[PDB]
Design a protein around this motif. Sequence first.
Motif, PDB file in Angstrom:
ATOM      1  N   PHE A  63      -7.171  -0.323   0.623  1.00  0.00           N
ATOM      2  CA  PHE A  63      -6.920   0.633  -0.446  1.00  0.00           C
ATOM      3  C   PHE A  63      -8.232   1.095  -1.071  1.00  0.00           C
ATOM      4  N   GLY A  97       0.871   7.208  -6.348  1.00  0.00           N
ATOM      5  CA  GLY A  97      -0.038   8.094  -5.656  1.00  0.00           C
ATOM      6  C   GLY A  97       0.625   9.392  -5.241  1.00  0.00           C
ATOM      7  N   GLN A 141      -7.789  13.511  -5.169  1.00  0.00           N
ATOM      8  CA  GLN A 141      -8.661  12.447  -5.651  1.00  0.00           C
ATOM      9  C   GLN A 141      -9.025  12.683  -7.110  1.00  0.00           C
ATOM     10  N   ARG A 186       0.819  -1.208   0.000  1.00  0.00           N
ATOM     11  CA  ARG A 186       0.000   0.000   0.000  1.00  0.00           C
ATOM     12  C   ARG A 186       0.855   1.261   0.000  1.00  0.00           C
ATOM     13  N   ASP A 187       1.795   1.348   0.943  1.00  0.00           N
ATOM     14  CA  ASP A 187       2.688   2.500   0.993  1.00  0.00           C
ATOM     15  C   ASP A 187       3.576   2.555  -0.244  1.00  0.00           C
ATOM     16  N   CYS A 227       1.503   3.758  -3.124  1.00  0.00           N
ATOM     17  CA  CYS A 227       1.159   5.146  -2.839  1.00  0.00           C
ATOM     18  C   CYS A 227       2.335   6.071  -3.123  1.00  0.00           C
ATOM     19  N   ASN A 228       3.555   5.598  -2.867  1.00  0.00           N
ATOM     20  CA  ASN A 228       4.732   6.414  -3.141  1.00  0.00           C
ATOM     21  C   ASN A 228       5.053   6.436  -4.630  1.00  0.00           C
ATOM     22  N   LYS A 235      -3.141  11.724  -1.439  1.00  0.00           N
ATOM     23  CA  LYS A 235      -4.278  10.810  -1.406  1.00  0.00           C
ATOM     24  C   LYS A 235      -5.556  11.471  -0.907  1.00  0.00           C
TER      25      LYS A 235
END
Lengths: 188, 192, 316, 732
Positions: A138, A85, A92, A77-78, A81-82, A88
């Motif tokens: 997520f 993403g 959106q 997830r991280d 996201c890095n 966040k």
Amino acid sequence: PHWLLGNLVSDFVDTFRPTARINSICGRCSLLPVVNSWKLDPATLRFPLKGLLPYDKDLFEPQTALLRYVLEQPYSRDMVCNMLGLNKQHKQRCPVLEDQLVDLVVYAMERSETEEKFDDGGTSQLLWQHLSSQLIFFVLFQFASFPHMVLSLHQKLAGRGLIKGRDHLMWVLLQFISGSIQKNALAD
Amino acid sequence: VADVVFVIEGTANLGPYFEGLRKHYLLPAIEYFNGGPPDFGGDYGGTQYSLVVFNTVDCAPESYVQCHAPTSSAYEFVTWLDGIKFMSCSLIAEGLSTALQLFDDFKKMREQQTHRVCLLICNSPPYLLPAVESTTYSGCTTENLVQQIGERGIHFSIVSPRKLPALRLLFEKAAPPALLEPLQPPTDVSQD
Amino acid sequence: AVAWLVAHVRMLGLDEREKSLQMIRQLAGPLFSENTLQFYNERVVIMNSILERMCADVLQQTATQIKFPSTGVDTMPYWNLLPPKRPIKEVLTDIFAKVLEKGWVDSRSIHIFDTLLHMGGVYWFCNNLIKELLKETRKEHTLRAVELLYSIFCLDMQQVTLVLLGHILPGLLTDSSKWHSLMDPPGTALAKLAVWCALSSYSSHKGQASTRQKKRHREDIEDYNMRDPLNRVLANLFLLISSILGSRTAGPHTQFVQWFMEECVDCLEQGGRGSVLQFMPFTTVSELVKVSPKVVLAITDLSLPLGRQVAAKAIA
Amino acid sequence: LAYVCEWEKWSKSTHCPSVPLACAWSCRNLIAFTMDLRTRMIHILDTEHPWDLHSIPSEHHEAITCLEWDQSGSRLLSADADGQIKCWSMADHLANSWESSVGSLVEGDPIVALSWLHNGVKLALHVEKSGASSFGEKFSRVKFSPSLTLGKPMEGWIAVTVSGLVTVSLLKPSGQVLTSTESLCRLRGRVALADIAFTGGGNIVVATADGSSASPVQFYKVCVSVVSEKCRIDTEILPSLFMRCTTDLNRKDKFPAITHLKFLARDMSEQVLLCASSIVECWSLRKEGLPVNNIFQQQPTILKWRILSATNDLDRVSAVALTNTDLKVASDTQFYPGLGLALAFHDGSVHIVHRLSLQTMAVFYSKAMQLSWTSLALVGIDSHGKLSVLRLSPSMGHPLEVGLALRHLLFLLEYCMVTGYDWWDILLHVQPSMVQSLVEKLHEEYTRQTAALQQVLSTRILAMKASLCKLSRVCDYHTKLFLIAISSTLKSLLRPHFLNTPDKSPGDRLTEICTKITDVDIDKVMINLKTEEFVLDMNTLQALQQLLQWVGDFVLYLLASLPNQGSLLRPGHSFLRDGTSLGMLRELMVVIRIWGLLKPSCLPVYTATSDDSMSLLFRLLTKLWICCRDEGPASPASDGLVSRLQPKQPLRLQFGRAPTLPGSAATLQLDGLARAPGLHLGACPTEECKACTRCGCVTMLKSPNRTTAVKQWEQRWIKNCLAVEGRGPDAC
């Protein structure tokens, strides 16, 4: 290119492609060693940067396989996201990632529908549950055009994949609706 | 439960009038069986039904049926009620026989013995010599109605339009009363 | 036994008594029980088993599996290999896509392509071929694709190539809708393929294949010296080329036929013979030169007074 | 030699090598004319007025196969199967509008177009001959399992992948839903076949692979009705077989290319030598047990095909096998095309001859084709290039039999009537001299032996009468029948169209008794019967100015033309001595009179003294009614008094009608263009001002009708009008 134009541009792109070939890097096999300015970081479904004329679409098609491999592993997830993403909570925009997650869920269902891992013969159910948990955690852009899930289910309906997956489908849907009960409404 | 079915045939006879008839009798009744027109959940819950509306035999040399309505989830029914085309005799005997056969196969397959109920309304005056021509049934419109009434006490009522043709009298040949008693200027009652 | 099992497969297949007969035949019955005066039944049994196995495949599939009387190492790898519950729209996605990035004809899929070819029709075959070809939009891959296509197109060169040309070239020059395709250098690659297969076909060719010798009975007049199908098709395509060389509209096709004439240059060639009785090739070459010395020399077959005309015209 | 066209600017298309052709419709408008001009689109043309040829763009390549099923305008659009079956139902049958109900067979090219609804009705003509059977036993229908029923008969476009080699799946019947499935079909196969949908049982079967070269036929007994939103197509292997013709040691090159079948899957096998070769064949399914003997001192049921008829011939293209009659009947004296089989000869003329005889028939000495219909009039699409259609003589055999001929004609016409199909026996029927006797005998038989279906077949029989009397001379009775039909329809529609208040008896039943009333002084009987309950709504003042003028002008034209028997025509324009119709028009006039009393804007005489003519008009028409009801006089003091014509005579009445094909006996050739000479809201203006929807019977009205509340007429005429096969459209 222009019909009444000659093959001059074609032969020029031809003689120029060895340059970008010499400037090519690799087949983009896989890059996910980290467990936490960085390598293998595409912005919007496109890793390459140079505006040259590289070889065939092998490097033009988005590296879906890479995200496919990294998503099944927890704690990604991280990482995702890095790598893709940004803001966040303040940005959106619901990117193309919905197709990626739909394909991942379809693959998960297929692996679960395929004899149910030889009637619980192994621990594939554990990996499935972990992937489902990651996807539920997520849940920020998953129901962007929520009918995407219905489309994925219709696509997975081919070959009659409702033999044994049904239980797992209901379970992951329950997980998601529990993670998004008070947030969204029943309309979606 | 409330497993009721709706059948109409006055499409060819009266097109514009059918809209008002719908919005006055069926559309309010549709809210008695639905929480509101959106979608909605639909499955094998017993309360499902059919939707049979066709035309007469005169302008039909190669086509009589285009129906498709297993459940309709109580929404698609009222959805296609408005969205239907239109077009002497009525040939309603064929539709009545098909609906009878459908109710029979339902009772024989959808059992739970199930207190089947149904309502039928047709503004067009029906009269025809053939009855079924598709199954064991054979006779006439009068024979069809006395069969649907006398042989089996299928609960049926007929709330006809305010206009009355010369058919109500002949339609009293059934030993079970047609029960046209609910004739009141007040609006459509939910369940009398 | 195999012949009658096949004959019973040609029946209602409701009895399957021949199936039990074949099963008994494949069983361990003749296990040297009687006084078999052979002394070589061991190898004889192997030959019998492999012969039983190679045929009756329909019975070996539609019925229960045999008790494995082969006892070998690996049966015949070449087989149907066609996914049953899948459409035909996979020949490009499973073979043509891979072999494009590959460096050879993928000998494994060669048999598959043979089955597809002798199973379907050459028309849609070549149609989907050229359709997949018109996807690279880059000279090198288009060249590689057409090179490998000419090779995979073999084993049926003459008739398949004749039909392919006489269908796709008119099917592209006839209207302007298909002119959209030939505008690309893929068009030049296709022209090269065309002239290559034409020159190969015109020359002596044996063409003895499995799925060709037993499937060489057709009929065609082409609705277009001598009366030969190949020669007739060549004259037809030449006439269509001359017609396409016409005026009043020209974006892609004059360049296409220019590439065609250029690639037509080849030693020991004999195409465009141009019989001198009532044939168009004279005025055709005249208009072609009226569009450098390739056609000016090709038309000069034997320095006949007919050729003197086009010589004077090319002199300008 | 007649009815042949040609195209000036188009030629043989020297660029394109060739293309196969196919087209057929069992219903009206049976011409589709697949072709390629100089990838081309699809065309549509009707049997009448063939000058206005129409076409429509397709959405695929090469347009390889299309074949409709019912009168509902539809097609298949094969070659990757895009743009499948749909309805048109818009204004006419000249716009495709292919809906999204299409099954995308990715990279395919099938040649199958089948799966009709049910079997054709049976005809015991040889036995019954419609003597006194009242069409009951003369024309019946055996019970047949409907294809893919679910008490409702559904229907799909299931076919066979010609280019493909495995199977067809993914049926989406009339629901626009996906309903995806998969089929195995023996897990193997290679097909270049033609399909045979309807067999004995309610199932589908099909088998052919390559031709006479090998002998494989993968018969697939299939069933699709298993469960909602799923299919389980079976692959039952029926006994395979082939054409024994290859046993000849002389040659073996047969290689068929058609192998057509019929709806009776027991009694044909269209394998035929089709090399550059010609040898027709025919097989059967005669089941028989095997002679189990010679094994000792002394389920046996099995199926082994049998040969029926085969010979060496000279032909290339077939047309059709057989809407035929039933078998097991010794139809010796029958010469109509009962199970009639046709076949085209390459060299010019066509030698159509039924099975099991093959000898010869009438040919009348001087690409691909098909059989137009039972009426022997083929289409000239033989292997001769881009040539138009042609006509042939429908003579059923060499000898003549006028009595038997007219008998057969009446029989087939009654069959067409009871089946409600299109009719093109124009070329087949004898000159109109006998037609009069024919039509009167037909009407007598219909009225007597209806027995009660007359009340629903009146319109059909009147349309039949009109159509037959059109071509002939007797156009007077033709127009008379048109006007009678239209006014009868109008009146029958207007009668129960009263939203009145209830009473002792029904409003229509009470209004019907007006016939039992005095001759003059309507003002009395109108209030004596009823006056109040006649209003339906305030917004009803649209019929007087638009349509009510029709009946007024009609009765005035009847009045003025009565005392003119001295004209050079015994019936003049018309006579209308029925009486009942007169009483019907009288009822119409009294109801429009009570309407005028209810609203002053009725339909007046429009000429002069419009504001008590209606009174004297009613009086005169009642006078003629009484003087003509029970075998009365006709066109003497009555004539003298009606000879007075007040300043009220109108004119310019429509008298709707359409041209025709007067090809009497020898020759009438028409081209594709430049045709050679031979409601009541207008329907014939000077200038065009709308879409100008055309029509066949009388209508010629507007397509959207440009109105607000006349939707009753529009609704009743939404579908095909009275015999409205010629219900077309035309620009400008």
